[PDB]
Amino acid sequence: SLLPVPYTEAASLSTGSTVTIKGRPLAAFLNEPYLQVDFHTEMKEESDIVFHFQVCFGRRVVMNSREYGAWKQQVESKNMPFQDGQEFELSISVLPDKYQVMVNGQSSYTFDHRIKPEAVKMVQVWRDISLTKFNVSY
Amino acid sequence: SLLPVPYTEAASLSTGSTVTIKGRPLAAFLNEPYLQVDFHTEMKEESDIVFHFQVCFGRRVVMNSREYGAWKQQVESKNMPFQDGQEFELSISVLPDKYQVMVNGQSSYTFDHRIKPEAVKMVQVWRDISLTKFNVSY
Question: Of the candidates A85, A122, B31, B51, which lies 20 to 30 Å from B16 by C-alpha distance?
Answer without folding.
Answer: A85
